[PDB]
Design a protein around this ligand. Sequence first.
Ligand SMILES: [Zn+2]
Length: 228
Amino acid sequence: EINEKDLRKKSELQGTALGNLKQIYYYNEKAKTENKESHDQFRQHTILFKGFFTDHSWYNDLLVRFDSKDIVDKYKGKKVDLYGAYAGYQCAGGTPNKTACMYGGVTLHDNNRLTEEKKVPINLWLDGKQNTVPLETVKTNKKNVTVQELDLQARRYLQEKYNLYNSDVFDGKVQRGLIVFHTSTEPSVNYDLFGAQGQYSNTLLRIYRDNKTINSENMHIDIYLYTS
Ligand SMILES: [Zn+2]
């Protein structure tokens, strides 16, 4: 859905934007658990996992937020697996004290586990030159996987290897970047790595609120990074 000349420059990011992006993709807290269920709803298009956290320094409950009633209805009252980044700062006003919020991150549990862990191949280009990416960098045990699960893993590696969301003074050389989740069937999801209004940490991950899921079978990821 995006061409390279239309990629947003890192220099456009205002204020706390880079710091927020680095936190959400490299210093995050993730819910990663299997075979859970809830049909408790707070309001809106949400599933509330009461007492999800037993040893968190602030949270007791996890609130999952979705875009629509059709999406929440797919998962409400079903055995699901979770894989997403949560935080209190992701909640809308009036969410209960000690509740943390995640956007999407849910998949049906049943019949979704692969027998062999899927290593998702990555094609990465930096200023047009291919760079080798370890095959274990992005992996999943799910047949139907959230784009969130794959994007969190890919961007954590981009921060570690290329200092993606570091300032220019802290060796963050990449100025533009695109990630594509290239499926066998289905138009591919693509995200501009510098496309968000990063200064609003509460909505940074609202892109995942659609709970988009894709088939991992035979898929791969393409990453295009530019230093200008
Ligand atoms: Zn591709």
